[PDB]
Design an enzyme around this catalytic site. Sequence first.
Site, PDB file in Angstrom:
ATOM      1  N   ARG A 112      15.070 -47.549 -62.754  1.00  0.00           N
ATOM      2  CA  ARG A 112      15.018 -47.576 -64.233  1.00  0.00           C
ATOM      3  C   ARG A 112      15.947 -46.467 -64.665  1.00  0.00           C
ATOM      4  NH1 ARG A 112      10.284 -48.290 -62.319  1.00  0.00           N
ATOM      5  NH2 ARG A 112      10.129 -45.992 -62.285  1.00  0.00           N
TER       6      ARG A 112
ATOM      7  N   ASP B 137       7.902 -46.315 -55.852  1.00  0.00           N
ATOM      8  CA  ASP B 137       7.981 -46.891 -57.190  1.00  0.00           C
ATOM      9  C   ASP B 137       7.063 -48.045 -57.528  1.00  0.00           C
ATOM     10  OD1 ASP B 137       9.174 -46.449 -59.817  1.00  0.00           O
ATOM     11  OD2 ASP B 137      10.668 -47.963 -59.457  1.00  0.00           O
ATOM     12  N   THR B 138       7.015 -49.101 -56.780  1.00  0.00           N
ATOM     13  CA  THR B 138       6.294 -50.311 -56.982  1.00  0.00           C
ATOM     14  C   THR B 138       4.782 -50.093 -57.015  1.00  0.00           C
ATOM     15  OG1 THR B 138       6.430 -50.755 -54.667  1.00  0.00           O
ATOM     16  CG2 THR B 138       8.053 -51.891 -56.118  1.00  0.00           C
TER      17      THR B 138
ATOM     18  N   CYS C 117       8.217 -58.777 -48.816  1.00  0.00           N
ATOM     19  CA  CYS C 117       7.835 -57.367 -48.768  1.00  0.00           C
ATOM     20  C   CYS C 117       7.114 -57.020 -47.475  1.00  0.00           C
ATOM     21  CB  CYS C 117       6.811 -57.122 -49.905  1.00  0.00           C
ATOM     22  SG  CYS C 117       6.454 -55.305 -49.999  1.00  0.00           S
ATOM     23  N   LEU C 118       7.593 -56.037 -46.751  1.00  0.00           N
ATOM     24  CA  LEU C 118       6.940 -55.573 -45.542  1.00  0.00           C
ATOM     25  C   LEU C 118       5.830 -54.560 -45.859  1.00  0.00           C
ATOM     26  CD1 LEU C 118      10.246 -55.544 -43.836  1.00  0.00           C
ATOM     27  CD2 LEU C 118       8.212 -56.409 -42.658  1.00  0.00           C
ATOM     28  N   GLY C 119       5.925 -53.981 -47.046  1.00  0.00           N
ATOM     29  CA  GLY C 119       4.885 -52.995 -47.403  1.00  0.00           C
ATOM     30  C   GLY C 119       3.759 -53.634 -48.206  1.00  0.00           C
TER      31      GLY C 119
HETATM   32  C1  HEM Z   1       2.985 -53.843 -55.489  1.00  0.00           C
HETATM   33  C2  HEM Z   1       3.797 -53.155 -54.640  1.00  0.00           C
HETATM   34  C3  HEM Z   1       5.052 -53.829 -54.076  1.00  0.00           C
HETATM   35  C4  HEM Z   1       5.720 -54.871 -54.579  1.00  0.00           C
HETATM   36  C5  HEM Z   1       5.424 -55.721 -55.814  1.00  0.00           C
HETATM   37  C6  HEM Z   1       6.854 -55.105 -53.707  1.00  0.00           C
HETATM   38  C7  HEM Z   1       7.789 -56.093 -53.868  1.00  0.00           C
HETATM   39  C8  HEM Z   1       8.839 -56.305 -53.001  1.00  0.00           C
HETATM   40  C9  HEM Z   1       9.789 -57.394 -53.158  1.00  0.00           C
HETATM   41  C10 HEM Z   1       9.756 -58.345 -54.372  1.00  0.00           C
HETATM   42  C11 HEM Z   1      10.607 -57.384 -52.110  1.00  0.00           C
HETATM   43  C12 HEM Z   1      11.848 -58.267 -51.804  1.00  0.00           C
HETATM   44  C13 HEM Z   1      13.137 -57.932 -52.535  1.00  0.00           C
HETATM   45  C14 HEM Z   1      14.329 -58.891 -52.259  1.00  0.00           C
HETATM   46  O1  HEM Z   1      14.093 -60.017 -51.783  1.00  0.00           O
HETATM   47  O2  HEM Z   1      15.459 -58.415 -52.544  1.00  0.00           O
HETATM   48  C15 HEM Z   1      10.202 -56.272 -51.262  1.00  0.00           C
HETATM   49  C16 HEM Z   1      10.790 -55.899 -50.071  1.00  0.00           C
HETATM   50  C17 HEM Z   1      10.419 -54.830 -49.292  1.00  0.00           C
HETATM   51  N1  HEM Z   1       9.395 -53.932 -49.580  1.00  0.00           N
HETATM   52 FE1  HEM Z   1       8.028 -54.127 -51.048  1.00  0.00          FE
HETATM   53  N2  HEM Z   1       6.866 -54.171 -52.696  1.00  0.00           N
HETATM   54  C18 HEM Z   1       5.763 -53.377 -52.900  1.00  0.00           C
HETATM   55  C19 HEM Z   1       5.437 -52.329 -52.084  1.00  0.00           C
HETATM   56  C20 HEM Z   1       6.081 -51.830 -51.004  1.00  0.00           C
HETATM   57  C21 HEM Z   1       5.716 -50.646 -50.245  1.00  0.00           C
HETATM   58  C22 HEM Z   1       4.472 -49.792 -50.588  1.00  0.00           C
HETATM   59  C23 HEM Z   1       6.615 -50.507 -49.265  1.00  0.00           C
HETATM   60  C24 HEM Z   1       6.642 -49.416 -48.179  1.00  0.00           C
HETATM   61  C25 HEM Z   1       7.641 -48.538 -48.120  1.00  0.00           C
HETATM   62  C26 HEM Z   1       7.582 -51.576 -49.399  1.00  0.00           C
HETATM   63  C27 HEM Z   1       8.616 -51.847 -48.518  1.00  0.00           C
HETATM   64  C28 HEM Z   1       9.431 -52.973 -48.596  1.00  0.00           C
HETATM   65  C29 HEM Z   1      10.493 -53.295 -47.658  1.00  0.00           C
HETATM   66  C30 HEM Z   1      10.834 -52.376 -46.459  1.00  0.00           C
HETATM   67  C31 HEM Z   1      11.136 -54.363 -48.119  1.00  0.00           C
HETATM   68  C32 HEM Z   1      12.357 -55.074 -47.504  1.00  0.00           C
HETATM   69  C33 HEM Z   1      12.135 -56.353 -46.700  1.00  0.00           C
HETATM   70  C34 HEM Z   1      13.531 -56.976 -46.316  1.00  0.00           C
HETATM   71  O3  HEM Z   1      14.482 -56.649 -47.023  1.00  0.00           O
HETATM   72  O4  HEM Z   1      13.424 -57.736 -45.349  1.00  0.00           O
HETATM   73  N3  HEM Z   1       7.223 -52.345 -50.466  1.00  0.00           N
HETATM   74  N4  HEM Z   1       9.081 -55.670 -51.800  1.00  0.00           N
HETATM   75  C1  LIG Z   2      13.293 -54.623 -55.100  1.00  0.00           C
HETATM   76  C2  LIG Z   2      12.528 -53.670 -54.202  1.00  0.00           C
HETATM   77  C3  LIG Z   2      11.064 -53.441 -54.612  1.00  0.00           C
HETATM   78  C4  LIG Z   2      12.596 -54.088 -52.694  1.00  0.00           C
HETATM   79  C5  LIG Z   2      12.112 -52.852 -51.909  1.00  0.00           C
HETATM   80  C6  LIG Z   2      12.401 -51.698 -52.821  1.00  0.00           C
HETATM   81  C7  LIG Z   2      13.298 -52.345 -53.878  1.00  0.00           C
HETATM   82  C8  LIG Z   2      13.658 -51.545 -55.137  1.00  0.00           C
HETATM   83  C9  LIG Z   2      14.619 -52.687 -53.135  1.00  0.00           C
HETATM   84  O1  LIG Z   2      15.672 -52.072 -53.216  1.00  0.00           O
HETATM   85  C10 LIG Z   2      14.055 -53.831 -52.315  1.00  0.00           C
END
Ligand code: HEM
Ligand SMILES: CC1(C)[C@@H]2CC[C@@]1(C)C(=O)C2
Length: 404
Positions: A176, A241-242, A347-349
Amino acid sequence: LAPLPPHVPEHLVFDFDMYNPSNLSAGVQEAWAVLQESNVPDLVWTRCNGGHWIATRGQLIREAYEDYRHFSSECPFIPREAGEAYDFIPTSMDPPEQRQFRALANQVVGMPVVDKLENRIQELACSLIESLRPQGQCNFTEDYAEPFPIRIFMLLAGLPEEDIPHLKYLTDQMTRPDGSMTFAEAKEALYDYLIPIIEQRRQKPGTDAISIVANGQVNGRPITSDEAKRMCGLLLVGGLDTVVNFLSFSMEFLAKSPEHRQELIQRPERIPAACEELLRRFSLVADGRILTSDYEFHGVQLKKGDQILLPQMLSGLDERENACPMHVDFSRQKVSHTTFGHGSHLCLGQHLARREIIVTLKEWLTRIPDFSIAPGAQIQHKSGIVSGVQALPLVWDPATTKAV
Ligand code: HEM
Ligand SMILES: CC1(C)[C@@H]2CC[C@@]1(C)C(=O)C2
Ligand SMILES: [K+]
């Protein structure tokens, strides 16, 4: 507004700005959902932020995330220069190349690790809520939403808490931007921070997330310093952030809706189901993809190099995926969404997030069953790659609470 590209027909121009949507004062989700009105075509063109396609329906959003041959993750952010500078791993990669890096990442933030962190996550939620309980009031964003997920991530990563303000500042400029930093400057500053750490932990491998990534193998060969830095930086951004903003949307809603608080207080075993319906309703991410070649999609001609925003927040808000989508129904039979992405970059997290969400609802409602928005407050939301809540002043009568 950027000049309309030759190939884009005037009847699809829908000038939405993702970092500053028009009905934002009505709620960021409601601001984005203007894109799902009766008049709005399924796929529109905004000239804001350099110009880009915006798919508005779940059907289109899912198909484009599935079609990585045409919609590549190589440039996944708007504006274009942010997408071009974007080189995090594994998110800037497409299968097949993506797959080996994603397995390593999965080793550091997946389900087995959520299980290891179970006790600390529980302890910290109870601790922070116990601390706020007797005050009868809090600034939710600063007093819980931020510290709860951030301190768990800093713990997993083995990074000192004093570094939080620097790192959250850089992460927020990537999602943001306030104008102070470009995406590229923010990214470079996070990489700058990780460089020495990676090098130290390559020499003395430890148990923390940075050591595990930095000394890991990607389908059998050693990851490089560079690759470790680009995976680590993605991990911090994802951890800072998320969940942080998501918890704020969800507590704002519960603060405005006594009947939903009553339902989870009466039937706590429904918390996991409620968490999922909240993820649907208060979905918050929107990133996108880039066209790998000319391609005709749902009858609209896309040009090689065109960027397309595929708002993950939009799929569960779509009336065609869920009946009365703006309505929160914890008993919703088929809660459909793309909140955690869709396709190969799911999402892996997500397991870590759902655990933080369920623990927060259960432990807050256990100690502070009844609470409301501070009298006279107007909650302001903010939009971008990750949308969020500017501040959330909550009040409660301490006499109605319980120490547990
Ligand atoms: C409500 C909380 C969360 C939401 C809504 C969320 C949402 C997302 C989304 C929409 C993507 C895919 C983005 C794309 O396709 O370009 C993503 C990817 C990912 N998220 Fe989350 N996320 C959350 C929490 C987290 C947390 C806590 C972590 C831990 C650090 C995390 C780690 C990742 C990773 C490593 C990816 C990459 C997967 C890849 O590129 O194969 N996320 N997440
Ligand atoms: C769109 C996302 C939530 C997903 C993991 C963090 C994020 C900002 C990226 O750059 C990939
Ligand atoms: K790129």
